[PDB]
């Protein structure tokens with residue numbers, strides 16, 4: 001298992017990302033918590049080779065799959081980059097995923113550095 | 114708008130480039146569909162003055178921004194030349210971008226000439 005404070009730092013960072021609200025009170029992470037299934041949106045799985053959602057990221061913290069904050073960052077960047085790949089530039093989901101990459105990076109800097 | 118057959122030729126050429134697989138079954142265009150964002154890879158935007166990806170190229174065909182196959186070629190060459198500028202010689206991304214320039218040129222010759 002990971003050291004307790006590393007798991008605590010990962011949960012604090014991911015909770016900051018998931019709970020973040022924009023100035024209109026909207027929780028930007030909402031659509032990213034659970035991917036649509038292969039039955040609901042088969043086109044997503046045709047285009048995205050490594051799907052991931054925040055439910056999977058929290059599971060990977062619980063199961064100690066990430067060995068560092070760098071490992072955690074790689075999956076959060078993947079989730080957002082996948083959203084940017086599937087969606088059109090300027091769409092709400094595409095733009096929300098860019099904001100969440102900034103929220104992750106600043107939360108990591110506050111909580112760990 | 115462009116004449117329908119010109120848009121058809123551009124989509125046929127770009128679909129050949131995007132769908133191309135090497136002999137190991139790998140779709141070489143994968144990494145080039147959507148650039149990493151400025152938050153994910155700020156160094157790319159510091160070094161590359163005119164970033165472009167295949168999502169942008171398909172948008173420019175849809176919006177009739179390219180007025181000829183020469184205009185289309187210039188952006189595909191830019192994408193690959195940018196990949197060669199950012200990456201080290203001999204890296205997979207650098208070498209894949211050289212192969213895609215050949216795939217574009219041969220697809221243009223088949224489909225249009």
Ligand SMILES: Nc1nnc(-c2ccccc2O)cc1N1CC[NH2+]CC1
Nearest residue numbers: 031032034035052053082083086093
């Ligand atoms: N368009 C979409 N793009 N991306 C996601 C998505 C969800 C979780 C993790 C990563 C993701 O990229 C969900 C999407 N939609 C939700 C609303 N219904 C249409 C489909």
Ligand SMILES: Nc1nnc(-c2ccccc2O)cc1N1CC[NH2+]CC1
Nearest residue numbers: 144145147148165166195196199206
């Ligand atoms: N190294 C990289 N170089 N180039 C691109 C790239 C992407 C789209 C269009 C043009 C490009 O040049 C992506 C790169 N990487 C992807 C994997 N993660 C590390 C960054």
Ligand SMILES: [Zn+2]
Nearest residue numbers: 035036037040
């Ligand atoms: Zn749904």
Ligand SMILES: [Zn+2]
Nearest residue numbers: 077081149153
């Ligand atoms: Zn990425």
